[PDB]
Amino acid sequence: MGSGTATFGKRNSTPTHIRCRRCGRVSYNVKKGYCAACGFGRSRRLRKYRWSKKWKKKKNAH
Amino acid sequence: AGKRRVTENIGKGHSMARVERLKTPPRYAAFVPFARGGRRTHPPKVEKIIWEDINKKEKRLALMSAIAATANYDLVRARGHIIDNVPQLPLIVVDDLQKVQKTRETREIFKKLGIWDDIVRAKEKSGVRAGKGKMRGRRYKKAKGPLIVVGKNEGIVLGARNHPGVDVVVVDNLGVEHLAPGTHPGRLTVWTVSAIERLRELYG
Amino acid sequence: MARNKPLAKKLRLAKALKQNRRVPVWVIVKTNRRVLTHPKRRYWRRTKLKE
Amino acid sequence: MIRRRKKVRKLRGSHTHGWGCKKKHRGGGSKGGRGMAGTGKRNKSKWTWTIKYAPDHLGKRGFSRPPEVQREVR
Amino acid sequence: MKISSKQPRKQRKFLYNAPLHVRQKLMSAPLSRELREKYKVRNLPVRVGDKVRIMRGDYKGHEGKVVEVDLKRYRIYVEGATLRKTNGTEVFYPIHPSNVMIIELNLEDEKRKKIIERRAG
RNA sequence: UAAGGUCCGGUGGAGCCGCCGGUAUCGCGGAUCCUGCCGGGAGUAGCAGCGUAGUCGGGUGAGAAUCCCGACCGCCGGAGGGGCCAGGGUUCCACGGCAAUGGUCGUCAGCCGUGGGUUAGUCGGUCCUAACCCCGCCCGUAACUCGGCGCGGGGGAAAG
RNA sequence: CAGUUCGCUCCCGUGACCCCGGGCUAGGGGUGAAAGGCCAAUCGAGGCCGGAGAUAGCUGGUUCCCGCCGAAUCAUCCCG
RNA sequence: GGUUGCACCGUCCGUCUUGAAACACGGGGCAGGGAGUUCGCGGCCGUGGCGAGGUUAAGGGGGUUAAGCCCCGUAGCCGCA
RNA sequence: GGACGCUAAGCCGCCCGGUGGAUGGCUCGGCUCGGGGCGCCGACGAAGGGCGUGGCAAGCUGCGAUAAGCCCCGGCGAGGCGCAGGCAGCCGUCGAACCGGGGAUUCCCGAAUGGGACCUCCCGCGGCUUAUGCCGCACUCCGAGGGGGAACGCGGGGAAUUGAAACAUCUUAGUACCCGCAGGAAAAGAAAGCAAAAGCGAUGCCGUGAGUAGGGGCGACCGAAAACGGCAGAGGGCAAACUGAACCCCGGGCCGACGAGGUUCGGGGGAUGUGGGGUUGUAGGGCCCCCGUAUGAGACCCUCGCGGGUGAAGCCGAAGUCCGCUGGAACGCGGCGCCGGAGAGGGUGAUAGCCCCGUAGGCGUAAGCCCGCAGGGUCUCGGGGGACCCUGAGUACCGUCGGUUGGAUAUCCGGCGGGAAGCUGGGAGGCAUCGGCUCCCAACCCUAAAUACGUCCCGAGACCGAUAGCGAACUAGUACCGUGAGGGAAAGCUGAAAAGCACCCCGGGAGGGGGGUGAAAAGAGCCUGAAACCGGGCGGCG
């Protein structure tokens, strides 16, 4: 679409995800059951990647 | 460093240069030769020159030349080393000199011979260095005095290292650095009968 | 309501409440020159705030 | 001892530095292409070699025997 | 010649970080000339419990008792080595033990007595 | 010739050179270059436009056109007002202040500082099931935090 | 005033209507009363990071002095 | 040296261009940052050693606090058709 | 007419004060390299994360409602109470702080596991006790496992921009990226090998062989190995043939130094075969016969006393702080003097061998390691006689199609189809087949040592130094932004000691000014204090 979108919707209001407790990010999806910052509610592993994208952020965060 | 931040384009349309800065804060850059925290044109490598071969013949001739400079009074004085014994250079002393490793007893033989005057120079710090190089270390040094060459009593002698500028060696492990430090020739040597006899023989 | 604050979230909010205080005097004497007040002071119109 | 930069100095305001124009020095097209850049090629991408003879070719033949059956006498 | 730290920056880092027991050693001061010979002990770690003389710095020839030994600021306070404050107080004057020489040894710790007689000599 | 160097006077209050042989993240006038600091524009425009509000006494105070009290006059009037859903999170209340903040102003304030205020068998959440979702087991896939079937179980409404 | 505003005017206002909350459909795929429109200020094929310092025959720019010699802008070939 | 009058001359700077004082492009001003580096291989050159020969690599012994230099190792390469 | 008689505003230069933060010196930080260490941990409830906790606490750091901590041992031992140099207050010298090992408690969340869940909450058993206190339990194996871990290692899956001046084989590349998985190295590894036909006998890695053979629009490009010199070394055990229970495991007791070794008692495996035998190569496979005869000289292990070194990161360690002078302070100048198995580098009010940490030298032990020294236990072996023994299958090998590699007729592996032989036999030596010659036994398994890493500790610099080097030297991956994935800064310096300004005048004034402040032009992001720029003034012009 077309620039000028920010007066139309009172959005963000009520989320579409919530505060995790495996990482505390605001991505534990209440309409599924999946964490998209580290995996939880569908998973017993943390995400395992050699990108690094996550692994690096996490180490610095830790 | 200098690929630490992604580098994304500010573009044209607003009348400034099209030269990339960053995403979130336009205030720094990367993958440019400017910026805090960045690369230049090409950083310094670990791969830089650090070995230089020299041929066995070529190295040996250098040793011969540097020891020849020592036996000429004029070169020794030019380097700054001042000697009482004008007609005699280098000095050979009796074989007993090695065994002595009282710092004070081995000092006295030097004083008499007139070769303490070089050691006074090294008492004065002349390896003093200006600039901020003090921060990295390796200043306030002593000047290289005479060279004491022994046959044995190990490679270092325990009554000939304490003295200023007196650096100890053996004739099996002799080197161009000891003969003419800095590529300035004209540094005194002092022999022991067993070293002099063993150097007569050529090793390579 | 506002909906709604579980038991742990009142604790978090409470941590957040503490931070919005200026640094007390006794610290600055103890350091012996000085510690500026330093941004963790909270507004309520101007504060939107990821979790 | 001497460096490449030393030899260039900072120069005359040539702004190229011994390769003439600053528009024929900006990449790999400038070279005429990277690497050898064709030889037996039907296009004359690289036409003429580096010697006057134009281009000199490869893909001629004559066997080498197995290394074990050969002997080159000494 | 000697095992060294030739970077001054690491040498300083060593100096700051030291264990508490080692910090006492930096706070040692030469025994006066009569004593130094008599025990054969070069120096010993200055404490509260001793008398000391300041011979260098602004008071010279002054002697006084050690009030405090501070290991973070690496200075010691002696009574009558003092400053006068311009708000009408008399406040202590810190000086390092390196300017100072320890005029008398007063022993009231049993380890310390074992050392002076025996090991330290 | 020069690139450049040296000396003097003031400031400064601890480090600094020359000579020779080495070395390179080694010398800037420009890149619609990057960054910091600063001037002109200007003390201009903007602080008028939409249904357009103050004004006179008196109180307080270092200071009052816009803080408060009294009087008078408006604007809004099923809706620039009242109660709530979402959201905010202390903005609530109280007391003390004016350097900062309020398109001017300020003794006022949601600003700054410090204390204090939300007390539930009988309200609602929780619970029920809905659209629909997820987990285990079987199986697949080389394999999976992937995939759905067939079984078994749980979850699922702050306007039902 | 506003990264889409203001006034007036206009169309619809029981309907194939509008509207809330939950859930569902995801990238050569969806969704589309069909504009190549839309899918989080990005759609003739979204954003993110890695490959990656992609490549250019193409624009801009490339830093201290002095001394000596001092041009060619023609010729052949080439998807040139 | 600061500033200024007179006589005379004098259309920036850099880039682009066949031609720029330009109605071609770029610059508000000052400071700081700011662009020829490394490796391999080939072709050149200068110097130096040795000579129909030349050169050793890897390694361990050795020496040293470590290490370099010093000695051994000629595997292997090149030239002598 | 000329004259300075008044030329404002303003232009140019300089000067003085401010602004500003450049510049130099300064650096408890980076960066790179060398050596060694660390070399796994977790449902026996990890790591990670959250929220509290201190006298005052805003962040950091440390801990868990026993909350900047508690206990024990050994070591060092006379002042402490983290970053933070305030006051109050607290404890120790009758042994703290600190260091090493070990222990207690170690909330909630998280593999998280009974269930759900914005980091909270509720429950069904069984032990338990006064009891709800309190302890164990309800995901998946067998009668032990998830998950984590800095990279490295193993096995699979597997791009494209780019190059070829375009473009499709080829190239990029077996790279990026994805999944499973092990260790402190991994894996390979004790011969159906090599093939200079001669010589060798497990296997890694480094140098070399070599940009050589070979591949390839025969274009660009790609690319070995045998061998050599080194390094380090170590070999064996199953199935079967033939014997046929001669055997093995588990829990409890006893004996013995808990041990080495042996016994008994309740169960299980095993006659669909434990054990004996035998194991690359036919060993003669069997059964025999002479003798020493598998006890075993050794070789290995275990127990325990001694001795030696190592190991609680800790001890001990020489010699000027003398005189005169300058200065705020000597580390300066002159003079005298001192030590060395010991003139490194920091520090101290400045430029210190002898003022101090230290240093050359030597030394220490508990848990723990190594060796021999007192005892006990286990244990390999050796000859010639007939019929030579299925002695390892969808294998060998071939057929069809690919993937891949230098692999070329001659790489390696997979899928689909066919399909042997019995050491009397088979395989290999770079085309097929047949012959000679030589080497060598696939279809069973493990394996120490030499070789990879960079979490960490130390040492080092022709390395960098606060608009540089890590994004970050200073509460940083912090502040901050974004639905999220993800993105991401800036902020270093008083002085010897704070003496960090009493007391006084003025000012509404907490600001500022006057005076007193060793230096204050060191008076509060305060060492130094550039330029652009602003004000006034001076000199010239107008």
Cross-strand bridge partners of residue E28: E45
Can you say how many angstroms the Cα of residue E72 is from the centroid of all Cα atoms in its chain? 13
Q: CA B31, CA B20: separation in Å to the nearest integer? A: 9
Q: Look at phi and psi of residue A41 and say left if phi exceeds 0, alpha if psi is from -120 to 50, else beta.
A: left
B residues 153..172 contacting E (CB < 8 A): 161
Q: CA B146, CA B107: separation in Å to the nearest integer? A: 13
A30 interfacial to chain C (CB closer than 8 Å): no
Tell me whether residue E77 is exposed, middle or buried, using C-beta atoms within 10 angstroms of its C-beta: 0 to 12, 13 to 18, 19 or more.
Answer: buried
Residue with tokens 């000095």: B91
Q: What is the DSSP string of E64-110?
A: EEEEEEETTTTEEEEEEEEEE-TTS-EEEEEE-GGGEEEEE-----H
What SS3 class is residue E50? coil
**Residue from B147, B152, B196, B156 nearest B175 by CA:** B147
Which amino acid appears at position B85 of this protein?
Answer: N
Contact between B70 and B189 (Cβ < 8 Å): yes
Q: For residue B182, what is the DSSP state?
A: G
Count of CB atoms situated within 10 Å of the CB of B67: 16
Q: CA C20, CA C12: separation in Å to the nearest integer? A: 13
Residues with Cβ within 8 Å of residue B11, at least 6 apart in sequence? B18
Can you say how many angstroms the Cα of residue E31 is from the centroid of all Cα atoms in its chain? 10
Q: CA B150, CA B98: separation in Å to the nearest integer? A: 6
The approach used to solve this structure was cryo-EM
Q: CA B63, CA B175: separation in Å to the nearest integer? A: 7
**Residue from B125, B128, B160, B129 nearest B146 by CA:** B160
What Rg do the C-alpha atoms of chain C give, in angstroms?
15
Count of CB atoms situated within 10 Å of the CB of B66: 20
- Sign for the CA dihedral angle at E12, E15, E18, E20 comes to negative
For residue C37 the two structure tokens come to 């007040």
- Sign for the CA dihedral angle at E73, E79, E84, E88 comes to positive
Residue ranges of the alpha helices (H) in chain B? 56-70, 73-79, 103-113, 117-123, 176-179, 193-200
Residue with tokens 């120096």: E43
Residues with Cβ within 8 Å of residue B136, at least 6 apart in sequence? E7
Q: Is the CB of B22 under 7 A from strand F?
A: no
Count of CB atoms situated within 10 Å of the CB of D53: 8
Residues with Cβ within 8 Å of residue B110, at least 6 apart in sequence? B116, B119
Cα distances from A9 to residues A17, A26, B122, in angstroms, run 18, 21, 84
Count of CB atoms situated within 10 Å of the CB of B2: 18
- What percent helix, strand, coil does chain A show, rounded to 5? 15, 15, 75
Q: What is the separation, in whole angstroms, between the first and last Cα of chain B?
A: 49
Q: Count the alpha carbons within 13 Å of B98 in the hemisphere toward its beta carbon.
A: 19
Contact between B184 and B79 (Cβ < 8 Å): yes
Contact between A15 and A25 (Cβ < 8 Å): no
Count of CB atoms situated within 10 Å of the CB of E31: 23
Q: CA B78, CA B187: separation in Å to the nearest integer? A: 10
Cα distances from B204 to residues B60, B64, B66, B200, E4, in angstroms, run 7, 12, 16, 12, 36
Can you say how many angstroms the Cα of residue A44 is from the centroid of all Cα atoms in its chain? 17
Q: Is the CB of C21 under 7 A from strand F?
A: yes
For residue B37 the two structure tokens come to 């925290």
Residues with Cβ within 8 Å of residue B159, at least 6 apart in sequence? B100, B101, B102, B103, B105, B106
For residue B82 the two structure tokens come to 């001042």
User: What is the torsion angle, in degrees rounded to the nearest 10, for the CA atoms of residue B139, residue B140, residue B145 and residue B150?
Assistant: -70
Helices and strands per DSSP (H, E), number in chain B = 6, 4
What Rg do the C-alpha atoms of chain B give, in angstroms?
27
Nucleotides on chain H within 7 angstroms of protein Cβ: 14-17, 27, 32-39, 48-50, 54-57, 62-65, 67-72
Nucleotides on chain I within 7 angstroms of protein Cβ: 24-29, 32-33, 48-52, 55-59, 75-81, 83-86, 93-99, 108-113, 117-121, 146-151, 163-166, 177-180, 195-196, 213-214, 217-221, 314-319, 321-322, 328-331, 340-349, 352, 355-360, 458-465, 467-472, 475, 477-490, 494, 496-502, 516-518, 524-526
Of all nucleotides in the shown strands, which has a C1' nearest the CA of B178?
H69
Contact between B70 and B92 (Cβ < 8 Å): no
Residue with tokens 């006794």: C26
Tell me whether residue B143 is exposed, middle or buried, using C-beta atoms within 10 angstroms of its C-beta: 0 to 12, 13 to 18, 19 or more.
Answer: buried
User: φ and ψ at B50, to 5 degrees?
Assistant: -160, 0
Residue with tokens 């107080």: E89
C-beta within 7 A of nucleic chain I, residues 15-34 of B: 22-25, 27-28, 34
Contact between E23 and E94 (Cβ < 8 Å): no
Contact between B186 and B77 (Cβ < 8 Å): yes
Q: CA B194, CA B90: separation in Å to the nearest integer? A: 15
Tell me whether residue B150 is exposed, middle or buried, using C-beta atoms within 10 angstroms of its C-beta: 0 to 12, 13 to 18, 19 or more.
Answer: buried
C-beta within 7 A of nucleic chain H, residues 110-169 of B: 154-156
Residue with tokens 């009554």: B159
Cα distances from B132 to residues B111, D2, E4, E8, E120, in angstroms, run 38, 27, 20, 12, 41
For residue E67 the two structure tokens come to 């009030």
Q: CA B138, CA E5: separation in Å to the nearest integer? A: 10
Contact between A55 and A37 (Cβ < 8 Å): no
Q: CA E31, CA E45: separation in Å to the nearest integer? A: 10
Q: Are strands B189-192 and B147-150 parallel, antiparallel or unpaired?
A: parallel
As a rounded value in angstroms, the CA-to-C1' distance for E79 and I220 is: 90
Tell me whether residue B157 is exposed, middle or buried, using C-beta atoms within 10 angstroms of its C-beta: 0 to 12, 13 to 18, 19 or more.
Answer: buried
As a rounded value in angstroms, the CA-to-C1' distance for A17 and I113 is: 25
Task: Put the strands of the sheet holding E62-70 in their side by side order.
Answer: E90-95, E75-84, E62-70, E51-54, E100-104
For residue E97 the two structure tokens come to 């033990």
Contact between E107 and E63 (Cβ < 8 Å): no
Q: For residue D29, what is the DSSP state?
A: G
Q: Residue C50 and residue A24: Cβ atoms within 8 Å?
A: no
Which helix (H) or strand (E) segment is C22 a member of? none
Entry resolution (Å): 9.0
**Residue from B135, B137, B117 nearest B127 by CA:** B137
